[PDB]
């Protein structure tokens, strides 16, 4: 899907891993969770979380803003990473879909 | 793997065993008594200063700073001797009874 797909890359890495990422933007009154499918050349989890923190610090400040504006309501999380697998840089097809897809149903790994 | 097994076919005690001949003494046969402040390491006096004075006057050192091996020393039973440098008399062995 062209709407949910995004990256921060020239997508010229060879092995493109994929990552499901959702967020929790509290600029709306209840929540406006931006669901996203994210490819990346980067494969390690932690440094990817750091790059995502560098990209999504607006949702973090919105998270702390929800915490100060409503103490009784508990803030649940900020976002959850889960890898799905990996492909090749030519396997994309502009709705963007993949011809081969190795699967890896990883874990719900949260982050703030 | 050879799965052997054996059956005793004795009415009483066939086999004997004699302590025959001694080579050496592995221990110290010394007077270094068993120090209680490791075998009961968590217990301290309620007043802080008197416990500081007692551990000063007995030579036994307090925990210097709180690290994970000290926590494992308090919770588990661990290697809390931190063994001597030179060892010319083998092991060390005694205890206490009032």
């Amino acid at each position: 899907p062209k709407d949910m797909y995004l990256t921060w890359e020239e997508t010229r890495g060879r092995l493109q891993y994929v990552y499901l990422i959702i967020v929790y933007d509290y600029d709306g009154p209840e929540t406006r969770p931006g669901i996203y499918v994210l490819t990346s050349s980067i494969a390690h989890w932690q440094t990817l979380v750091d790059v995502a923190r560098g990209k999504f610090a607006r949702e973090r400040c919105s998270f702390v803003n929800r915490r100060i504006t409503r103490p009784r309501q508990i803030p649940l999380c900020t976002g959850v990473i889960q890898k799905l697998g990996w492909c090749l840089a030519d396997d994309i097809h502009t709705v963007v879909r993949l011809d081969n897809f190795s699967v890896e149903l990883g874990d719900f790994r949260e982050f703030v | 793997t050879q799965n052997i097994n054996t059956v005793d076919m004795g009415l009483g005690y066939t086999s004997n065993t004699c302590v025959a001949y001694v080579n050496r003494v592995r221990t110290d046969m010394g007077v270094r008594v068993q120090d209680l402040f490791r075998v009961f390491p968590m217990n301290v006096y309620r007043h802080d200063e008197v416990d500081r004075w007692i551990r000063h006057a007995a030579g036994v050192e307090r925990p210097q700073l709180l690290d994970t091996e000290t926590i494992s020393m308090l919770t588990f039973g661990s290697m809390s001797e931190r063994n001597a440098a030179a060892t010319v008399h083998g092991q060390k062995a005694a205890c206490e009874l009032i």
Partner: protein, 49 residues
């Protein structure tokens, strides 16, 4: 043919039977790695069973 040569050691309730009994050391959290050589005469579950 006496009563007891050490009244601070024999009866269940003295200091040594709560200092060297293994089943009484567990009520005080002792360092398990040390071999107390006196701990063979002071037990009861090892002795009476």
């Amino acid at each position: 043919f006496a009563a007891t040569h050490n009244p601070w050691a024999s009866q269940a309730g003295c200091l040594s039977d709560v200092l060297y009994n293994t089943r009484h050391r567990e009520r005080l959290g002792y360092n398990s790695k040390f071999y107390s050589p006196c701990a063979q005469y002071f037990n009861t579950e090892e002795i009476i069973a």
